[PDB]
Structure formats: structure tokens, C-alpha cells
Design a protein around this ligand. Structure first.
Ligand SMILES: CCCCCCCC/C=C\CCCCCCCC(=O)OC[C@H](O)CO
Ligand SMILES: CCCCCCCC/C=C\CCCCCCCC(=O)OC[C@H](O)CO
Ligand SMILES: *C/C=C(C)/C=C/C=C(C)/C=C/C1=C(C)CCCC1(C)C
Ligand SMILES: CCCCCCCCCCCCCCCCCCCC
Ligand SMILES: CCCCCCCCCCCCCCCCCCCC
Ligand SMILES: CCCCCCCCCCCCCCCCCCCC
Ligand SMILES: CCCCCCCCCCCCCCCCCCCC
Ligand SMILES: CCCCCCCCCCCCCCCCCCCC
Ligand SMILES: CCCCCCCCCCCCCCCCCCCC
Ligand SMILES: CCCCCCCCCCCCCCCCCCCC
Ligand SMILES: CCCCCCCCCCCCCCCCCCCC
Ligand SMILES: CCCCCCCCCCCCCCCCCCCC
Ligand SMILES: CCCCCCCCCCCCCCCCCCCC
Ligand SMILES: CCCCCCCCCCCCCCCCCCCC
Ligand SMILES: CCCCCCCCCCCCCCCCCCCC
Ligand SMILES: CCCCCCCCCCCCCCCCCCCC
Ligand code: NA
Length: 270
């Protein structure tokens, strides 16, 4: 029984270890992750004047999301390099007992913080019609919290109890589904009473939102998407998962933010 090796990254690291490629690739993608958030932070701060007052809370929330994402993704990247160490004899990177072990906590904390802000921020750009701001907000914040919390519980069982992993994941997915349903309503109401240029941007926001948020349960499942014998149940799963999380992060935070900013501009003077 493999004592050292919590989560799938540790498990792989403690058994098969990571190739140079896999270790370096993962380091670099996580580094790109936080680098982009820092760039984003400066972007959202510096452009805030370019939208009308009434929209500025959206740019503000983007900036705050960028701060949290930069800090926690920076910590996650450091946690990656600290957790695995090169063995010359075998020529691979293994879980380092004198390190702290890989910890998904950083990313899940980032999600808990950012999910409510990302869902919230669209409400400061669009106008609802027949829905109440407070109802939509409360729905977003509750479902968002529950989605991440149940996900985080699931994640614990990733190695040790796949049944629990998947059941908690399914419960989490239910909250996710509900978020998608609410957000679709928000975008539809948001499209009413605005210019076609604005409607087009909102169509794109919907598509970006749907794809980028769905990447997360994708990445959660990733090591198992070819069965317990398959090619992804390996350092290849770890690489894929971290790549997909990073793409999702950039898309759901930065690209999302840029589209909302462009929507606010389109509404702002035009
Ligand atoms: C992203 C979340 C989407 C996930 C949605 C999936 C559907 C979940 C519902 C029922 C799962 C049924 C349980 C099947 C698990 C079988 C466990 C197994 O075969 O492996 C032995 C394990 O190690 C010892 O529990
Ligand atoms: C490869 C290294 C990783 C870097 C990854 C890039 C980070 C995101 C940056 C830009 C997103 C592009 C979004 C561009 C959207 C344009 C806005 C728009 O919709 O058009 C304006 C509107 O029509 C009238 O205001
Ligand atoms: C900036 C970070 C964001 C937008 C994170 C979003 C995270 C999710 C949408 C996570 C969803 C999950 C499921 C739907 C099932 C498996 C567990 C999660 C938490 C990964
Ligand atoms: C106006 C558009 C500004 C583009 C900003 C490009 C980011 C550069 C990254 C920093 C290196
Ligand atoms: C009109 C909209 C212009 C889009 C500019 C988007 C700028 C976003 C800056 C963050 C991404 C920069 C990546 C640099 C990391 C190295
Ligand atoms: C556009 C008005 C902004 C008011 C701030 C509301 C957000 C505070 C969250 C509690
Ligand atoms: C609301 C934004 C404040 C940032 C929250 C993230 C806390 C920093 C922890 C980094 C790990 C050390
Ligand atoms: C880009 C280079 C980053 C330089 C250092 C970043 C500092 C992040 C600190 C993470 C923990 C914050 C403690 C509150
Ligand atoms: C529901 C999400 C809760 C995530 C909490 C994890 C916080 C741990 C921060 C990093 C762990 C340090 C080692
Ligand atoms: C402003 C929207 C509320 C998000 C704040 C962060 C959520 C608490 C997580 C700790
Ligand atoms: C969508 C409804 C799903 C009901 C399951 C609720 C599970 C509660 C999670 C406990 C959190 C501690
Ligand atoms: C999982 C990714 C594909 C799902 C596409 C869902 C598109 C949203 C359309 C609304 C229908 C789903 C509503 C879910 C139930 C809402 C709870 C009330
Ligand atoms: C057909 C118009 C497509 C533009 C919407 C944004 C594309 C989705 C980006 C995927 C995120 C990763
Ligand atoms: C028409 C404007 C398209 C905006 C979507 C941007 C998605 C970028 C994916 C790479
Ligand atoms: C219905 C939304 C389409 C997005 C598919 C992306 C999810 C794939 C999971 C990553 C592997
Ligand atoms: C909510 C489920 C999202 C997972 C999509 C990825 C699985 C598709 C690959 C086969
Ligand atoms: Na290392």
C-alpha cells in the first residue's frame, strides 16, 4: 500500500515517477498560467476608465479574480516543483518525502473564491428583464459554492475510492448543470434591449462560458477517461489534466473578462 502517494499526481509521482518531459512541461504550463493572470491583472486595471461608470464593477471583479488567480496559481506552480525531485539512478522525477507533497488545495481555493465573482460580474454589464438581480446572484453563489465544495470532497477519494470520487463528482455536476441553466437565462435576458453588436458578443460569451467551464469536470475525470489500464492513467493524464485546467483558467477568467469588457464598451457610448 502506497503511503506517501492523497491525489493522482502524488500517486503517479510515488510509483512510476515523471519523465523529464512530463515534469518540465507541467512546470512550464503552470508558470504560463500565473504569468497570464499577472498580465491580465494589469490589463483590467489599466483599461477600467474606458467603460462607463455603471459597468466598472465588472472590470473590478476581473482585477480581483486576476489577483487571486495569480497568487494561488503561483503557489500551485511552486508546489509542483517543490513536490517532485530528480533521481539520477532511475532518470525520472519522484515524490519527494522531504517536500510537502502535491496539493490541489491551492486550485480548489482559487475556484471557491473566483467562481462566485465570475458569475456575479456579468450582472453588472447586462440588464435582466423578468428575473431579479438578488435571486440570480443567490442562485449563482449557492450553486457555485456547493459545486466546488462537493468537488473538493470528491477529489480526496480520487485514488482510494473511485466510487466516492464519481458520486461526489456527479453531485457536483448537478450544481454545475443548474449554474449553466441560470447563466443561459441571464444571457438570454441580457440580449433583450441591446444592440445586435452587443447580442453577438453575448452569444460568444455563452459559448466561451459553456466550453471553458465544462473543461473543469473534463480535467477532473481525465486520468480515468481511458479506464484504469488506459494511456491517461499515467503521467500523461497528469500532463493533460494540468494543461486543460490552465486552458480553462485562462479562458474562464481572462478571455471571459475581455469579452465582458468589450460588451461594456459596445453598450458604453455606441
Ligand atoms: C465530473 C463528474 C461526472 C461523473 C459522473 C459519473 C456517474 C456517477 C454516478 C454513479 C457512479 C457509479 C459508481 C461506479 C464506480 C465503480 C467503482 C470501480 O469500478 O472501481 C473500484 C473502486 O476503486 C472502489 O470503489
Ligand atoms: C499563447 C499564450 C497564452 C495567451 C492566451 C491569450 C490570453 C487572452 C488574451 C486575449 C483574448 C482574445 C479576446 C479578443 C476578443 C475581442 C473582443 C471582441 O469581441 O470584439 C470587440 C467588439 O466587437 C467591439 O467592442
Ligand atoms: C476560474 C475557475 C473556475 C471558473 C472554475 C470552475 C470550476 C468548475 C466549473 C468545476 C466543476 C466540477 C465539476 C462540475 C465536477 C467535478 C468537480 C469540479 C469542481 C471540477
Ligand atoms: C491593447 C492591447 C494590449 C495587448 C497586451 C499584450 C500583452 C503583453 C504581455 C507582456 C509581456
Ligand atoms: C479589444 C480587446 C483587446 C484584447 C487584449 C487582451 C489583453 C489581455 C492580456 C492578458 C494576456 C497576455 C498574455 C501575456 C503572458 C505572457
Ligand atoms: C455597480 C455597483 C457596485 C456595488 C458593489 C456591490 C458588490 C459588493 C458585494 C457584496
Ligand atoms: C480576494 C483576493 C485575495 C487573494 C486571496 C488568495 C490568498 C493568497 C494565498 C496564496 C498562497 C500563499
Ligand atoms: C512573476 C514572478 C512572481 C514574483 C513573486 C510572486 C509572489 C507571489 C506570492 C505567493 C504567496 C503570497 C503570500 C501572501
Ligand atoms: C472547497 C474548497 C476548499 C479548498 C481549501 C484548501 C485550502 C488549502 C490551501 C493550500 C494547502 C496548503 C498546503
Ligand atoms: C464578491 C463575491 C463573493 C466572493 C467572495 C469569496 C468567497 C469566500 C471564499 C473564502
Ligand atoms: C442537486 C442536489 C444534490 C443533493 C446532494 C447534496 C449533498 C450535500 C453535500 C454536503 C456538503 C458538506
Ligand atoms: C454538460 C455540458 C452540456 C450541457 C448543455 C446544457 C445547456 C444549457 C441548456 C439548459 C438546459 C439544462 C438545464 C439544467 C437544469 C437546471 C436546473 C433547474
Ligand atoms: C463561433 C464563435 C466562437 C467564439 C466563442 C468563443 C470560442 C470558444 C473558446 C474555447 C475556450 C477554450
Ligand atoms: C469574434 C470574437 C471571438 C472572441 C472569442 C475569443 C476566443 C479565443 C479562443 C482562442
Ligand atoms: C458541450 C460543451 C462542449 C465542451 C467540451 C469540452 C469538454 C472536454 C473535456 C476535456 C477532455
Ligand atoms: C459533466 C461531464 C463533462 C465531461 C466531458 C469530458 C468527457 C468526454 C471525453 C470522452
Ligand atoms: Na523539483
Amino acid at each position: 500500500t502506497q503511503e506517501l502517494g492523497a491525489n493522482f499526481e502524488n500517486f503517479i509521482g510515488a510509483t512510476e515517477g515523471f519523465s523529464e518531459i512530463a515534469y518540465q512541461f507541467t512546470s512550464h504550463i503552470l508558470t504560463l498560467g500565473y504569468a497570464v493572470m499577472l498580465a491580465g491583472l494589469l490589463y483590467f486595471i489599466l483599461t477600467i476608465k474606458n467603460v462607463d461608470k455603471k459597468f466598472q464593477m465588472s472590470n473590478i471583479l476581473s482585477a480581483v479574480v486576476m489577483v487571486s488567480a495569480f497568487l494561488l496559481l503561483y503557489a500551485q506552480a511552486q508546489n509542483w516543483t517543490s513536490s517532485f525531485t530528480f533521481n539520477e539512478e532511475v532518470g525520472r522525477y519522484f515524490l519527494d518525502p522531504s517536500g510537502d507533497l502535491f496539493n490541489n488545495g491551492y486550485r480548489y481555493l482559487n475556484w471557491l473564491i473566483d467562481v462566485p465573482m465570475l458569475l456575479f460580474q456579468i450582472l453588472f454589464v447586462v440588464s435582466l428583464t423578468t428575473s431579479k438581480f438578488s435571486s440570480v446572484r443567490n442562485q449563482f453563489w449557492f450553486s457555485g459554492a456547493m459545486m466546488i465544495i462537493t468537488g473538493y470532497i470528491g477529489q480526496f477519494y480520487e485514488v482510494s475510492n473511485l466510487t466516492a470520487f464519481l458520486v461526489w463528482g456527479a453531485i457536483s455536476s448537478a450544481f454545475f448543470f443548474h449554474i449553466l441553466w441560470v447563466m443561459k437565462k441571464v444571457i438570454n435576458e441580457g440580449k433583450e434591449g441591446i444592440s445586435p453588436a452587443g447580442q453577438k458578443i453575448l452569444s460568444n460569451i455563452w459559448i466561451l462560458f459553456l466550453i471553458s467551464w465544462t473543461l473543469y469536470p473534463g480535467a477532473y475525470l481525465m486520468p480515468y477517461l481511458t479506464g484504469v489500464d488506459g494511456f491517461l492513467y499515467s503521467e500523461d493524464g497528469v500532463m493533460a489534466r494540468q494543461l486543460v485546467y490552465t486552458i480553462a483558467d485562462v479562458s474562464s477568467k481572462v478571455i471571459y473578462g475581455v469579452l465582458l469588457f468589450n460588451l461594456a464598451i459596445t453598450l458604453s457610448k455606441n
